Assembly symmetry: C5
Homo-oligomer: 311 residues x 5
């Protein structure tokens, strides 16, 4: 089987369509997601043309082995997709209507700067390499681009499934390649994060601030240091799941700040004690009294600044 | 091989049946379960009809390649099922009795709102895409829908295996699709949870409440903060296994409340100490004395309110 | 290829044998184990009979494709076994001697009640579905049922590999099925458990009991609470590996009891301090003095009671 | 199909080219990386030459089964690559232009000495075993060696993708083998490491140094020991991911040093207390006062010696 | 294809040879390792003999399907190896030189008694089952037994790759089986263990011994109990990776001893305090003073005893 010949010198247009059946396994660390969808393909191969009257059928059905099928691949996949041809339907003009159900593990980079209030655009890149006999160009049949209403991605709200109609035609290793960008828009379900991660993490930090209403150095050392351990332990408990980003993340900057606050609270506790011990309780008392306002205010200010910078 | 032709303009009825052999690997986080079952199919292909008396045989056996078989798929699977055709049998009227043994990883969303006192309905959706020559419609042979008595799902009580007889017939990408809902009803084995999770978690919280029979600020800081660490450590120890739900969970609400209680207990401890130190031991004593009743009562009340809202 | 025809109306006997080559990957949580073994099959097919005299050969060798072979499957496997036919040999009377080497992941429920002093019976269920032309019944050739001496299962002592000779014949999906129970008896290597799990866990609990020779409330709070954290930390450190059983386990009952003891020790510590502070040191002293005997004795007694109930 | 025959006694040159499409799953512990790329092959087989004039077509397309193709393998792979032949092109002179898309898990050792400021050279070794009829030699077509601009490796900056043009010819199992070294140069994105790992780890150590402005042995024991726990807890929290190197690593040395510092800080704390208790507070005070400078200075210095020693 | 016939009644000798290309994934817990190697096979099949003079060829090349090849399997594999036939060559006498590249996961038990100062012998058992027409016996071509110089196994030094020339011929299920033992000698890279595991673990234990230069019961309880937690935490941090051995390990015995030492240190701390409180400070002081020498000496003595017993 060779590709269909051109009537003049025109390229072959392969009309594509992806219909999302199932969407699952979004791995934040791997920056991968698993997909189960229909891939629809349509091209004209006149060699297959028939007379409905002589054939006594309006549409002819073929096996994948019987006819020529364009070699469509996905660019950003781990391994080649697991596909199962559902139907091949030839109308008398020689128009082929191909359909397969496939599953694939798609590699799409993520932007963690606004985590856990982040939205993402997942890409599925369709590609076709042109042959020596003729050039193959991809196209989008928008009526065949969709997603099942039941499509769920644990932890995300599925916004839209669309395709950038204009293909990216370019040369590679001395041949033409026609690329198609299919986009899945998702936004994270940040609800759980408040009572699950944020609130208990803020309570632990607030406990350390009680050292500002105490003069007992032993009690204060216990408050600061034990809370620091509790903070780390709590972090171990919470599945962050995030990879090592080359840039600074919102949640990342806050976490760093929380570590700084434990350190500053220790300095204060240490300073207050030294002044008291070094017979200057007036200074020690003024520092502690200030800290009571200073700590929450500086925290609240720095968080507003952070939020502003990130959003 | 083409589909059997219609006598009039009627659709082809494919009688289905799933018989559960093995059920395993229910992943609470992935919302997936693995299955090993029989898939029975039945349709009429008059082209295969025979005279039993002339043939000498009451039943003819065929190879999958030899005859036309409808393309049945599962909607909510990760990849296509691993199937092995067990038997194909033809009766004189052209009735085909197909049977295959398959294994598949099924995606079924779970409702964690009542965890660990939750019950679930696991779905296995059967589907068939209609062809150009005729429409294909799914049906349920109830005598062919069952489950092996030995079927076990670690941590769950298997209630029932049934099918919603009425198929969901709908159009998809310009063709008819007939869908069948097979339901596996399971309820969680919540026994272990009491002595394994709940009771030790309540004991740790109760230990923090002893700070209400103490005036030693050092001892009290140690009680509240060390128990908070113990709580987090205990949580790390216990495999919750739950994913990040967009909604609020029963266990989730209680856990949040337990974190609030550790924070309030710190406030009390802090307040009592400040009043004592600021020469007002009468107030400090009344607060501590009240807390002794207030803490268990508010806890018990709040839990009752929550339980009521969730059940 | 069709099944061999009956002389009268008698069923076909398939003589089976399993010889264990390798045994590995016993997963306590999944209740699965991996097996590598030989599967021997023997049955009479008179269509393959030959006169050794006019042929010159004592035995004829065939390819699996060339002759009819019964479709034997395993009931309790995740997916179908990976098999490789080693040999097929026909004796003059038409007796076929089949041999294949297979690997399979077998699902066999476990009884955790006596863990880590538990013994298990692992099941491998052989099955054959009868055909329309003839009924098939399984049998056990005991000379072909064995296990390699080198067979090891990390953490277990392999007791015996046997088969329940009498098959379980029953109806399934309107046809007869003949089932065979092959049993692998194993007992846990509980040695390591004493110096690795039990002993360090008892030492941590014993440290908490030193609070009965102390009057320092601060020191006592530290002893009881810090050991409770150490207990939890130690538990995190030790790989229990056990699933959530619907029933109560021996180890699980002890663990619960240990948690109760930490709680009771706190009550004592709290009570002793309150009495002392509330100017009644005689009662406080009697309680502490009693606890010194009460705690070890009640512990030793309830452990004897538990052990008795479980064994 | 036999190899093309030599005109004289010259070896066959197979012109190779690897074009990186996707790069993912760099496992620092396994020292493996997954790669999805094009493998281009070119060689002359005069048996496949044709007179363009007599033939009518300029390029003859073949199926892999139809013609002889050299058996190219990768040395450092876990299992054989998953390949899909994209195109086979024969020019009139018999110059074969082969192209396949493959995915493979490549084993490449890593140098952890400079972690997390390390750079790595990932190797992909191409190999061909010579046959009895003719010797086969590999070559690099530099115009066919590249990488997709979109190629990303989470946590690394992709520097270059090149090949060592001169193949490594050598004997193996009595025959000649021609090896090609393809090199992927990567450097670690060490940014995150500072605010995420280093800085919080230094803060915890700095908290331990406050014991040098305290005389309370109880407060000091709490500071040193509780920070040591916090350090270990923090380490548990941070995914190092590193394997057990036979050599000393930079990080490994700093981490070791941090453990030594906690031990020395304990000695000091212990010494200071003993002198005080043994009625020599002047020595105790001088030691503590010195430690305040000694600890940061010796730390800062040892780190410069370490940094220099490693870079 | 039938086996080559015997001239008399002699067995067929299959000359084997394994050449290690890649060695990876040594799992201490599973007692498994992954391998990528060449498998060379040689046997004489006179039916394939030819006159080189008339044939014009010195050697003839065959496809696996074309000729008879002995069924060689590995005993201690998880599933059957993934093999790819590299070459089949026949010399004028009918000698067959077979070569395949294979990957397999090998099950080889390990001896942990001397961990981390342990050396291991990894086994790869080659096997052939004899047929009805003739007996098959395995042999070792030593020139074809080797390993790639680049072979690395993270955490181990690869000593040698050899084969026990004399096969193990024995009967199994009424037929002869010829077994070959290929041995890979490896020794653990124990360097890292000292600064990474041993030294920090000894420092934590040494910190607990400072309680022998203190009279503060509160400080002593904190020292002993907090170090015990730190010890457990440190153990959690360090990847032991070891399975539950039926026997006692060296490292295992030391770890147990360290737990005993924390318990004895508590007893001392408790005893010293009780004597002091019960107005007998002279005894309390003598016990503490003795402990200072007793603890390190008994530790040192016992380790010498342990080292001696294990080495
Ligand atoms: Cl693909
Ligand atoms: Cl399916
Ligand atoms: Cl099976
Ligand atoms: Cl390869
Ligand atoms: Cl094998």
């Amino acid at each position: 089987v060779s590709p269909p010949p051109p009537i003049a010198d025109e390229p072959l247009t392969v009309n594509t369509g992806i219909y999302l059946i199932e969407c699952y396994s979004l791995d934040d660390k791997a920056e991968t997601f698993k997909v189960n969808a229909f891939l629809s393909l349509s091209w004209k191969d006149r060699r297959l043309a028939f007379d409905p009257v002589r054939s006594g059928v309006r549409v002819k059905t073929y096996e994948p082995e019987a006819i020529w099928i364009p070699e469509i691949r996905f660019v950003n996949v781990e391994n080649a997709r697991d596909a199962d041809v559902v139907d091949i339907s030839v109308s008398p003009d020689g128009t082929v209507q191909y359909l397969e159900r496939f599953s694939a593990r798609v590699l799409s980079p993520l932007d963690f700067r606004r985590y856990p209030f982040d939205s993402q655009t997942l890409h599925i890149y369709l590609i076709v390499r042109s042959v020596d006999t003729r050039n193959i160009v991809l196209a989008v049949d928008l009526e065949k681009v969709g997603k099942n209403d039941d499509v769920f991605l644990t932890g995300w709200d599925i916004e839209s499934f669309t395709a950038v109609v204009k293909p990216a035609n370019f040369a590679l290793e001395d041949r033409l390649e026609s690329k198609l960008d299919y986009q899945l828009r998702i936004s994270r379900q940040y609800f759980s994060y408040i009572p699950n991660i944020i609130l208990p993490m803020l309570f632990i930090l607030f406990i350390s601030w009680t050292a500002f209403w105490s003069t007992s150095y032993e009690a204060n050392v216990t408050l600061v240091v034990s809370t620091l351990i509790a903070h780390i332990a709590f972090n171990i408990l919470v599945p962050t799941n995030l990879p090592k980003t080359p840039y600074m993340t919102y949640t990342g900057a806050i976490i760093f700040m929380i570590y700084l606050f434990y350190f500053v609270a220790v300095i204060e506790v240490t300073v207050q004690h030294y002044l008291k011990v070094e017979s200057q309780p007036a200074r020690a008392a003024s520092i502690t009294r200030a800290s009571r306002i200073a700590f929450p205010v500086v925290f609240l200010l720095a968080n507003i600044i952070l939020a502003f910078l990130f959003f």
